[PDB]
Design a protein around this nucleic acid. Structure first.
Ligand SMILES: Nc1ncnc2c1ncn2[C@@H]1O[C@H](COP(=O)(O)OP(=O)(O)OP(=O)(O)O)C[C@H]1O
Ligand SMILES: Nc1ncnc2c1ncn2[C@@H]1O[C@H](COP(=O)(O)OP(=O)(O)OP(=O)(O)O)C[C@H]1O
Ligand SMILES: [Mg+2]
Ligand SMILES: [Mg+2]
Ligand SMILES: [Zn+2]
Ligand SMILES: [Zn+2]
Lengths: 348, 356
DNA sequence: ATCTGTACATGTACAGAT
DNA sequence: ATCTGTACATGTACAGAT
DNA sequence: ATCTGTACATGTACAGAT
DNA sequence: ATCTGTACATGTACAGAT
């Protein structure tokens, strides 16, 4: 009962979706035209919608959209960045950009910013640049506030880099045919825009499988009929929404949680889904015991500082080098507290 | 156990398969290239391997291969022939490599098939490697059949197909009812792939005889056979085995064995058993209703179903539900009760015909 | 110089053979 | 159990054509 | 090459049936 | 409370026309 009521509060309304998307769409098509039908260095970018709104796991409001402008770049060679798994140098139209992420992102940002100054019918400005975002973020003021991430991404049709060979362990869940087919799809590089003052940081790209994650969200069952009109609904996404909400509520209260994000929850539940592949283990009637085991799994990830990237298994999202242990135990205690006390944080 | 041992006799041999496939591929590759050359009306034709060998349900010996030479034919058409569901006249809107086969807008299937056959025949004379001749045309068949004596005997049906990328003809709207078994996402995708038209090629002396085409879904059937489960891992290296293909195999063998002894069964063929089992797989969707341990009862329920189809004279085409392959107009009830008894005998007597 | 239809290159599920 | 040969999807190099 | 058109899956919303 | 059925909405893939 309780979790249900939370999910109805989390539900987006058809009317807010209609108005939010029609304005987002207007802006994104225009920015896409400016890239192509003007003789630019990104002539030929294609649009690919990603993220939780397009996975149907967006909660609360339709106020955050994610769009990837992807560009095919042929026979480009990669080189792994100090055995990290996820970050790569790109070596060999793109002349005026080793292919530089910061240089290529900067012009991309310029073009979008020029085009946004010429918007006159929608209240839209470009958010200030951020450290660690490959994105140009647009703040749109409908009556309401909507943010849009325009992600720049290179697209390579070659086979996936060696670090992902162990990745994507869907063989017991979605299957070897699905895996092999997914691995025939392209793979994508986005800017690692870190400002860490470290090393190759300006020339570093990050792998991106947002297109694979989108498929999996939309094809998440062991039975092909999971959540279709002639099958049984499951509660896999409803658990992801509840765990995203718990993290969102926590992050609002405790800035000591600034270094956590929804992709940690996303990653953790890809692992749970592979641990519990049967659709019956995610029966709607077990929603409470399913949330519960997901919190437990997330608490074992915090406690052991181990959250491997579902596609790059040697890339630990919970390594000391990314998040301090105090932050993890901070989060453990809040999680433990909410869990044993029937989630008071949900009731506000 | 009894049924396991049959399956072991039915299994093909990798040694036979290598020798068959090498020869067959050499020929098919050479006829496809010849299609490509010159001002051939069939330049652009494209190969597509179909049938039980490429579905991994070919039994006994690898002695029969089916290959589509398929040709994309843009520009719309299609006039359903007398509400039969399955048969169509092809019309053209522009006035073209297929200029020669037209009869004012209408594409002559037999004229197309005649030229196809002459070209295949001309290119067969010039093969000097392997013993391969072109079998005499059989009525009601879109195929050009190669008999190969790679020492042993091997058939290869070259089927001429037109390929249309449009949405499927409306007589399939209610067909392919996989929603509860393979699901709607699958159905929509499958219905987005092209559909194919092959020459009917009957010499019945009915109107439009030489201009009638028949629908073909062999590409959809191949997907279905290699993707037959509710669970995505059915029969994969990290999932549970089933016995769906094993039942079809046992069904096909009973029919083949019977069809050898008794010529009363000429009007029956493996598409009949194949069709009946697509219905069975839709009736029993779950992988657990096809557990390998239950092979006997699965084969049993499939037989009883087939017998009811025979006896009530109803075997609806899986893709064109208004097309009844067992309608009186296709097979005499005499033939249908002859098969009912022969099946009933085998079933009540521990399948003697398997021991042959 | 450039382009491209054809054929090779690469990867893996399936299923038989050990 | 592991090993292996065929089929098939997709990427890519190239001799020959523009 | 760009763009529209078509079909349908995934949603929300709600009324009536269990 | 849950389930089924219809209406209303957006996203998406691709054929065919420009
Ligand atoms: N740290 C990261 N490493 C790799 N990929 C990431 C990372 N953060 C985000 N992504 C990718 O970018 C996608 C969009 O990011 P983001 O908007 O933050 O998340 P989301 O999944 O849309 O969740 P919300 O529901 O909006 O919180 C999701 C994922 O494919
Ligand atoms: N009467 C028919 N109506 C529609 N499609 C047919 C018909 N007969 C055959 N086909 C199609 O052509 C394919 C090849 O037929 P055929 O060679 O007789 O059987 P098969 O499936 O190859 O099995 P076997 O070779 O007999 O083991 C199977 C099916 O997709
Ligand atoms: Mg989002
Ligand atoms: Mg065959
Ligand atoms: Zn589901
Ligand atoms: Zn199976």
């Amino acid at each position: 009962d309780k979790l249900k009521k939370v999910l109805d509060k989390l539900r987006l309304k058809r009317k807010d979706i209609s108005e939010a998307a029609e304005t987002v769409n207007k802006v994104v098509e225009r920015l896409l035209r400016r890239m192509q039908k003007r003789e630019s260095e990104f002539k030929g970018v294609e649009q690919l919608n990603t993220g939780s709104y397009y996975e149907h796991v967006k909660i609360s409001a339709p106020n955050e959209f994610d769009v990837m402008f992807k560009l095919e770049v042929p026979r480009i060679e990669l080189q792994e960045y100090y055995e990290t798994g996820a970050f790569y140098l790109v070596k060999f139209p793109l002349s005026h950009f080793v292919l530089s992420a910061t240089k290529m992102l900067s012009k991309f940002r310029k073009i979008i910013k020029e085009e946004v100054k010429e918007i006159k019918d929608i209240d839209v400005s470009v958010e200030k640049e951020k450290p660690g975002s490959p994105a140009v973020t647009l703040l749109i003021r409908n009556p309401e506030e909507i943010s849009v991430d325009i992600i720049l991404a290179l697209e390579s049709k070659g086979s996936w880099p060696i670090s992902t060979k162990e990745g994507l362990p869907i063989q017991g869940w979605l299957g070897t045919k699905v895996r092999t087919n997914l691995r025939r799809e392209p793979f994508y590089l986005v800017p690692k825009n870190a400002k860490d003052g470290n090393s190759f940081q300006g020339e570093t790209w990050r792998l991106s499988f947002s297109h694979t994650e989108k498929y999996i969200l939309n094809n998440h069952g062991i039975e092909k009929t999971c959540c279709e009109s002639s099958g049984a609904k499951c509660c896999r996404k409803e658990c992801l929404k509840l765990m995203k909400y718990l993290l969102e509520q926590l992050k609002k209260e405790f800035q000591e949680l600034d270094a956590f994000c929804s992709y940690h929850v996303k990653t953790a539940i890809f692992h749970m889904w592979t641990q519990d592949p049967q659709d019956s283990q995610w029966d709607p009637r077990n929603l409470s015991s399913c949330f519960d085991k997901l919190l437990a799994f997330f608490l074992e990830c915090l406690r052991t500082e181990k959250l491997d990237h579902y596609f790059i298994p040697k890339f630990n999202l919970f390594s000391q080098e990314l998040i301090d242990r105090k932050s993890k135990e901070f989060l453990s205690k809040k999680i433990e507290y909410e869990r044993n006390n029937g989630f008071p944080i949900f009731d506000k």
